[model samples]
Target: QDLSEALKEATKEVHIRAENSEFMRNFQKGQVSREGFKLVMASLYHIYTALEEEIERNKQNPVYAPLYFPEELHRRAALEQDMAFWYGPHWQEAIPYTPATQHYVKRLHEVGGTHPELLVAHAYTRYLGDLSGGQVLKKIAQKAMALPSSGEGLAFFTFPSIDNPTKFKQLYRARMNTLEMTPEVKHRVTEEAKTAFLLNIELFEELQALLT
Candidate 1:
């Protein structure tokens, strides 16, 4: 199988683990309060900040060239807009960096410096998750928070450039599978993808702990 399929298979268990975590379960049940969503977004902000910076730093690398889809895949700005909407002008001051998020940010920087191609796995996990189940989350959050139809508070899920997420993801997968890497690199990337899921699960669990 190709790298994308291999990575998917390798990370399947952790993906399910993350999807079924207590925080996600509560969010799906409409039990996540506005504050809960803000906390999640704050954690995500730290993650994407590092991820996007790493993407920019590695955009020109041979392994990264195939997967650089900045047009439809970048999320830093949208996340910032949503943060501003929810937390106001002083959003940064209001948000605290949890330990899970701190570790996640550190890992992104570590990989960016040591194994930049591995960032492809991080990109796949976060960006695709945003396009896929994250859309479902946007609707749930909107309804639960009674957000305006203007999409003010839902900016994180609004990909104005991606007119068709399904098609875009197909293209993304194709690009990912085409990336040339040695067997060892592929294995490391797959392992990193699973690590990415674990990081997400940790963030969710941390958020739930704070809420409780």
Candidate 2:
């Protein structure tokens, strides 16, 4: 079985669940507020920071080496810019690191430090999710929050180096199939992705409570 297709197939259920989370559902309804947007963006800064750190740690590993696209897929720089736009000059000290975010960051460190082989699972789930939803949500948030088309507050969604994400996604999936995962490793990768899905859902739940 193709690991790319398998990853897609296994995550199908939780993927749908994540989209229905209150924060996401409201976002689709164009109910995004400035505060909630800031909160979400702040949380993402921490998440991507951790995720990319692990990516750096394992960048040379055979398991994860093939998937490394430092300039093209990294979000930390984009997130930092967005953080500054939302929180002003001293944005680093102004952001909140919530419980769910801590938990997500912790898991990323664990995977990178010990089970480096499974990094692909996290990579596939996160980057593909970015490619899938980032564009539409950028437009939605820009309009819903009355953000300017100048793209100041929406830097996270736009991947500058990636000229065409559709072709890039297919390229990524094909690269995924090239990774050598044994039967058990493949199964565990699927499991990791499901957990990744739940982690994001819990994050959304946490974010919703703050919005209320």
Compare the candidates by TM-score and give the number of the best one. Answer: 2
C-alpha-based local distance difference test score of model 1: 0.88
Q: Could you tell me the C-alpha RMSD of candidate 2 in Å?
A: 0.8
Per-residue CA lDDT of candidate 1, range 78-128, in tens? Answer: 888988988999998987789999999999999988889798889988988
Off by over 4 Å in 2: none
TM-score of 1: 0.97
| Regions of candidate 1 where Cα sits further than 4 Å from its true position | none
The local distance difference test score of each candidate is: 0.88, 0.90
**Which ten contiguous residues of candidate 2 have the minimum total lDDT?**
129-138
What's the CA error at residue 145 for candidate 2, in Å?
1.2
Q: Candidate 2, residues 1-212: lDDT per residue as tens digits?
A: 99998999999999889889999999999998999999989999999998999999999898999899989899999999999999999998999999999998899889989988888888888899898777888889988988888788888998889989998888888888888879999999999989888889999999999889
Clashes of 1: 0
